[PDB]
């Protein structure tokens, strides 16, 4: 699909004439998980609710 | 990549001075005839695929050894490869006359056309004659007006003629 010289890409994200084809991978996969968020303690809430 | 505006920019940056007034008058002439660039590119892109078939027609009426078995254009796969080669050659001619600079055609065909054609065993003579006949047919469909408002087009004729001879001496 790419070869020697070709930069990779998302192959066939949006099928033609689809309004919403596909989610791009750079958003869909972050570089943390749902697990290192717990190690850092990043969901300290701003307490906007209640 | 390189447009004639960017050609003037690269000359003026290699000199490193501001652009001369007469060169800007030449660019004023260019933007005055940009609609004729549009006229020509539209005309030959309208008829491009039929031009490719007619060029292969004259080539295969001329040299029957290519159709003959053992010939380089003999097989169905290689025949589609031939029409692929001619179609993308005419495509880069249309790119060059749309840009106005031969740098696109040179930098994306001059490099490896001769190389692939000697490495595969492709006879460069047939491609040279075919791109010459294709260029003659392209000038034939570009120059004659069919319901088009009249004007002079000799500079464009010279331009695509130069582009097709650069293609012809590219493949040889």
């Amino acid at each position: 699909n790419f070869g020697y010289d070709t930069v990779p890409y998302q192959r066939r994200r949006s099928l033609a004439s689809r309004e919403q084809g596909e989610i791009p991978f750079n958003i869909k996969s972050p570089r943390y998980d749902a697990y290192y968020r717990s190690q850092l303690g990043f969901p300290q809430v701003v307490w906007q609710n209640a | 990549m390189f447009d004639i505006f960017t050609r003037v920019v690269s000359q003026a940056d290699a000199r490193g001075e501001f652009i001369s007034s007469d060169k800007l008058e030449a660019l004023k002439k260019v933007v005055a005839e940009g609609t004729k660039r549009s006229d020509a590119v539209s005309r030959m892109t309208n008829n491009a695929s039929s031009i490719v078939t007619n060029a292969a027609r004259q080539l295969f009426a001329d040299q029957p050894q290519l159709i003959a078995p053992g010939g380089n254009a003999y097989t169905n796969r290689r025949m589609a490869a031939c029409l692929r080669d001619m179609e993308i050659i005419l495509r880069y001619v249309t790119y060059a006359t749309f840009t106005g600079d031969a740098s696109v055609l040179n930098d994306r065909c001059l490099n490896g056309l001769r190389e692939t054609y000697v490495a595969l065993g492709v006879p460069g003579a047939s491609v040279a004659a075919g791109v010459r006949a294709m260029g003659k047919a392209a000038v034939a469909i570009v120059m004659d007006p069919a319901g088009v408002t009249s004007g002079d087009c000799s500079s464009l004729q010279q331009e695509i003629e130069l582009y097709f001879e650069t293609a012809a001496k590219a493949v040889e």
Binding site: - | V52, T53, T75, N76, R77, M79, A80, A81, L83
Partner: protein, 162 residues
């Protein structure tokens, strides 16, 4: 290049193994095919001129308009008839190579790769060669394992053609 010996070699190359007994059985099957395929190619080469001649005449009677209207694909004058008969002779020769090679490789490489593309850009119709191959597979008149192996190759060309 569909040859069961060479396909076995390509498989064992991709595995990186030595020759296995599967390949020995593959060779056995190739010999079993060839033991009638060679004689079938012989009688096909004997019949070939009458085959392509009857096939061209049958396609001309099958559609009268290709003889009728002046066109570039069609056989209005005799040069188009020559190119048409050259094409069916090419087809039958590919069938003979396909038979003698033990696989669809000569057919695949020499016809199937871009046949519909040149039919598109020349405005040919593949159904002409379809009914031509139907006349050939009706005309060869053979019996046995060789007949149906050839018929299998012919309808493979028909299916990939349409």
């Amino acid at each position: 290049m569909k040859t069961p010996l060479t396909e076995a070699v390509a498989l064992a190359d991709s595995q990186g193994r030595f020759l296995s007994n599967t390949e020995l059985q593959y060779l056995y099957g190739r010999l079993r095919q060839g033991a009638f395929a060679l004689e079938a190619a012989q009688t096909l080469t004997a019949k070939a001129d009458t085959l392509v001649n009857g096939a061209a005449q049958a396609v001309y009677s099958k559609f009268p308009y290709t003889t009728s209207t002046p066109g570039n694909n069609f056989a209005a004058d005799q040069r188009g008839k020559d190119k048409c008969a050259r094409d069916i002779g090419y087809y039958l020769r590919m069938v003979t190579y396909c038979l003698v090679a033990g696989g669809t490789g000569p057919m695949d490489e020499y016809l199937i790769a871009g046949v519909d593309e040149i039919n598109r850009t020349f405005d040919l119709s593949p159904s002409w060669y379809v009914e031509a191959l139907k006349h050939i597979k009706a005309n060869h008149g053979l019996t046995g394992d060789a007949a149906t192996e050839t018929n299998n190759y012919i309808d493979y060309a028909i299916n990939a053609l349409s």
